[PDB]
Design a binder for this molecule. Structure first.
Ligand SMILES: Cc1ncc(CP(=O)(O)O)c(/C=N/[C@@H](CCSCC[C@H](N)C(=O)O)C(=O)O)c1O
Ligand SMILES: Cc1ncc(CP(=O)(O)O)c(/C=N/[C@@H](CCSCC[C@H](N)C(=O)O)C(=O)O)c1O
Ligand SMILES: Cc1ncc(CP(=O)(O)O)c(/C=N/[C@@H](CCSCC[C@H](N)C(=O)O)C(=O)O)c1O
Ligand SMILES: Cc1ncc(CP(=O)(O)O)c(/C=N/[C@@H](CCSCC[C@H](N)C(=O)O)C(=O)O)c1O
Lengths: 387, 387, 387, 387
């Protein structure tokens, strides 16, 4: 029988050292590998092309996503970059979501201005906006679900089938939920990618990406382009990332416990105008998220009553929510997308996406529920004292 | 509120970098630190004496245990060696447990044979044996609870009060439960120590130790001795250990779920003569463990029916229990104490400990309970097929 | 005075830690950095965009090359990729050397097939071939000198001036000599780039790249593109790379001592048909290399008498020259460019470059001259025994 | 031929990976190694006992010193502690030098006060003081040559023969010259040890120690005791240390060049009362150093004219000599032994060592000789301006 996803993450590279029988995999930093006499390349030759420590992480994320293999890039942006270079050429069109990560928006828009591809920026949750984008015969559709930072939910089965009907490949950015909470390849997607910086690593001490292809042929094309462009990651970073992955299933139980308790505090608290969290029955996308996700996750964002003064008072004095970029760490974080995560967007693209100036995003960590709730209650008082 | 234990473990070193505001603490590998001009030592001078990355792990273990300070050593045995050198000299007597870790037994017996101290090896679970050791006016009593590998429960209240009445210091090896599950200092111990190699690091990729003193002055004596003897550990190892500590709570919730289910399978199974697990109501010590511990942990051992042939058949074919030394890893492990963890002991001292040639010890990981039970049931069949 | 290049390399990041006064710089792995309250970005925010450990290496290479700043990429190919994306768009033409690194050939040819730019492949050492390339109004000319693997020398001042006259930017791949042996920006080049994998790191345990721009504005454009494409390097790799740089000047004295003694053995030895080494007065490019370089380096290639049988016998039995890819490490290496480093080129592109099926390339390390010479003499005998 | 010292250091662990043929050795962090089925220990079982990455550094130091084996410890002081515990018991006498490292003095005086052994502190450069110590039938003599920080030269032939005639073991602290410049085991010492923190690592980013025994049985005793006491170091530190070792020869060529130039400046400069540097023909011990060493090294100390005010003015404004502890780094360093390296000693034991309150010690780096002399001349002016 096969093991579960949780077993496979915990045991990736365990007892797989033929040299010494090390239980925990050795770090192979070596740039280079000997040939076995003249003309006899071993399995590995050069670390930019292939490295065994990085391949343990690739093979582990491929097992977790149900793919034919994985490529580990220096950054998550690099994983998106790898997919655009492998799949697209001038004259091909790309469809992307309106409310994707601001750095995704930045790369799509910079590479389209150069004419590497034509860009259609669409709302993939509105059937009309989708059908108009697919009727332009795109080579590639990118889905980001749940979306950063408003947690809009796109219907994987629906969009993937509609993309296949017009001959488009699909790629899903699965960063916000990780493989442990969403498996886009199960619904027929061709590619899934991550910022490993987030949950997969879990300790905010690695920036990395991953791409997993369903098909062996498309995996080989990603290996070729990652080598030729020089986008592959450092073995040290793969080592820490693999170490991280071993606690992903354990981390996520505590994250989701904390996130449910915090959603219940923020939803119809008098100082809170709107919570965006797919776990609330009132959230547009809740029933989709409960169907295509194994849990509702631990990212959420919210709008305070009381304009900019309430935001400043809420944020200044948080002891357990560090005001910082990134997400998916064991440590709780808060960000202000307008000035931080989505500062790379124009004011116009933020307004089209529906990211206000008052929006705060929480990355809820694995600290004790009680300490996070006290911290958030004190912020809600500092905000109220602003009226 | 100060924070909970889980919050303190998650947040140790977080947002505590004055140079750049790094969220996650920088690794300070440097052997040396500049003076602030002639005659002005800064806080740090030299890594053997004091290092800030090491001191983040020291401070976090002191906070979790309730102590004045911590000293991080290169190994767990190094921690035991630090306490013996800081506290004892020739003419002092040390009391230790009969069923301690065999590497502990090896060090106690080697240093006693040199004349560094006189040794009394006693059953600290039995009032009689304890009172006969305390009648000899020891300088120091060492407690290991629960004990490796039979999980005997020493009564902390009882043994620490009786030792204080004869003027003895107490030290507890708290390796097997970690600070998250037992706090010997709350019972009045002078010292608690750990192999951080186990649950504190949690990833089987560091060997380390720590000692936490209740009292500031004994903490300064340990700092002095660790520096003089050169027993302090590496900043890189401290970074990995602090990183592992952040998931200690999350890991222990899965370790304990999995161990409660495996105990249920082995207790009363036709192929199991004996199970040693403090969480079983029929383990002597259950009621004690329920009151001095916050959980029953995830270490257990057991004796199969069917002699040597049953042991060999059980062990050959385990897929998810790696036959290896150590414990407290995310990865499940099995050991044969007689030929592995306790081979450092004489056949005689093992018989006095009541560690038999058939004993198997499990360190239960954080893999899916379903996989670990399928693996153990197939082992129990393979052993049954032996009769 | 400023210090010398050697002083600056040895002391890059020495005594620059404001937290503790650490003599050697801390490793800042953190993905993220706190804000200093709401709206107050610190100097660093996110490691893909900027990280202080990577910036020490950036700043050190910029100081060594005489530039406004340095960007550190995951790989050397990545550094080339960063320059092609920052500088070129469809319709711009690029001029590259005919005998550049085969991975450079692969990337140029793959992005030109996609139409990211038009490609002119020229012999930059032949005036006619250059003037015909420059008469086509290119946006960018890339020079690789000395060339891999034939050590062809291109006249930096000549080519850079001819490029400035038609409005072209120049970029020089300075991997083969490092900043310590050639400074292309001194001759007016706009950009210099390296595989830090080679001499700068020096220890074959990092794959990395660097790009240094003369002008502050072009440096800012590289920071922008490196962030948006996600091409930035791991801080751990920057740490090891900086540690490596500290011995570059010391390593290169022994490399060049060993290379001079090996060129003298190989040149007009009866089994050696041709040596390509810029230190020989007979080498096309010697007087140029003596003018525009501070030494002749430690890369060289050679052609044995006796066809494929002589190659196979020379290579099989080398004790001190490991048959592997890469170069610039303290360990001596040998490669066969046709089947290894230049296997990415078509047979047609190799023949146009003048890379035969018989060519061997040596990366001469810092072992004792005597042991390397014995190893090479025994290889020359095994080669002679095949006639 | 076997290879030279330089070749052995460069090539230690090169091409010695059976799993992938990694050129540079993998980092084996694992605490634990699997058994090959029930009852079959592999070569490695547990990192505290034995680790292959650590053993590559042990084996390379043994090869360089001509011994049977090496044991790598967490610190240099840990190496001294290992030897004291493996060899001595109460009733034994140890002879140590009057002018040893102050941390050595602290350990000897602390463990003698406990009664672990009787201590004789003697001037081993003076025949009379030596013979009076040897007339007491010591179990062990420790030599430190050259001595920290006055560079006194002990006669290895003389002291080791005199100690063998009374049945005493000898151990030499070879920290100050490294195996590349002195080999105590060629003179018949039983043991040689190092702070690997200094020249062997060479990059001021590891604290470590090593002990090499001439005889295979004493090496086995050191392995046993290091294991039992838990003094063994971290695999990560061994990896960095072996990495630094590879440039030991190249670094020492520059260190020695720079040190000969600085000795030339300080010897008979009008502001310099005394220089202690074995390479000066007038240093007592010159002729001995010339015969028993392969170079005079790069440690020196000196006494300025002009009392405390001259010291303070010399030290304030040094740009290239960091005021800090340690030595043997690529970075130049300056220490005040009385307030820094030797503050662990009493004013009396310093007076007996003849370490005055005016003494400054230089660790000369591999920066440009021209820069280090500009820095020192400006320091000498600043001190002159004081009269
Ligand atoms: C959904 C999604 N996909 C990709 C990524 C990529 P990676 O590893 O950081 O490269 C992310 C990352 N999101 C992050 C990173 C914010 S950093 C923005 C500031 C920086 N100064 C910049 O210019 O980029 C987030 O939403 O916090 C994501 O949410
Ligand atoms: C209760 C307890 N205290 C201390 C330690 C110390 P450390 O980090 O390994 O130094 C332990 C470790 N127990 C471990 C490690 C045992 S491995 C013994 C084999 C080795 N060949 C040897 O000779 O030592 C265990 O019981 O698995 C412990 O259980
Ligand atoms: C001159 C030059 N510029 C750039 C680089 C780039 P980097 O760090 O490896 O990414 C190099 C590297 N040269 C190297 C690397 C050869 S690895 C070839 C095999 C590999 N299987 C592949 O497909 O690429 C060399 O010439 O040895 C160079 O010589
Ligand atoms: C000759 C010699 N033997 C051993 C050592 C051992 P290790 O790696 O530091 O443990 C040394 C070290 N010399 C170093 C020691 C750094 S001084 C540290 C002062 C510190 N606050 C303390 O109390 O110890 C030196 O002389 O600079 C040596 O010179």
């Amino acid at each position: 029988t096969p093991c579960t996803a949780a077993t496979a993450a915990v045991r990736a590279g365990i007892d797989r050292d033929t040299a010494y029988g090390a239980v925990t995999p050795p770090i192979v930093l070596s740039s280079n590998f000997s040939f076995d006499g003249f003309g006899n390349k071993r399995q590995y030759d050069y670390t930019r092309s292939g490295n065994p420590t990085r391949d343990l992480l690739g093979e582990a994320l491929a097992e977790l996503e149900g793919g034919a293999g994985g490529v580990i890039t220096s950054t998550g942006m690099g994983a998106i970059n790898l997919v655009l270079n492998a799949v697209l050429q001038p004259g091909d069109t790309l469809v992307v979501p309106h409310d994707a990560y601001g750095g995704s928006w930045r790369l799509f828009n910079a590479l389209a201005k150069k004419g590497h591809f034509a860009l259609i920026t669409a709302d993939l949750t509105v059937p009309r906006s989708l059908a108009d984008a697919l009727a332009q015969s795109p080579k590639l559709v990118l889905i980001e679900t749940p979306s950063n930072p408003l947690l809009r939910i796109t219907d994987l089965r629906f969009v993937i089938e509609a993309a296949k009907k017009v001959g488009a490949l699909t790629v899903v950015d699965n960063t916000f939920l990780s493989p442990a909470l969403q498996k886009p390849l199960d619904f027929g997607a061709d590619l899934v990618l991550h910022s490993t910086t987030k949950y997969i690593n879990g300790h905010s001490d690695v920036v990395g990406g991953a791409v997993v292809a369903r098909d062996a042929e498309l995996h080989q094309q990603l290996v070729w382009w990652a080598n030729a462009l020089g986008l592959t990651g450092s073995p040290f970073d793969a080592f820490l990332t693999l170490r991280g992955l071993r606690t992903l299933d354990a981390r996520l139980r505590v994250h989701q416990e904390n996130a449910d308790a915090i959603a219940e505090l923020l939803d119809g608290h008098a100082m809170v105008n709107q919570v965006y969290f797919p776990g609330l029955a009132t959230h547009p996308g809740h029933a989709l998220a409960a169907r295509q996700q194994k849990g509702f996750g631990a990212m959420m964002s919210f709008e305070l009553e009381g304009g900019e003064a309430a935001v400043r008072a809420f944020v200044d004095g948080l002891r357990y929510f560090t005001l910082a970029e990134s997400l998916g760490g064991v440590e709780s974080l808060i960000a202000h997308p307008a000035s931080m995560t989505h500062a790379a967007m124009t004011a116009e693209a933020r307004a089209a996406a529906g990211i206000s100036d008052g929006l705060l995003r929480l990355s809820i960590g694995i600290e004790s529920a009680e300490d996070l709730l006290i911290d958030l209650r004190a912020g809600l008082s500092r905000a109220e004292a602003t009226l």
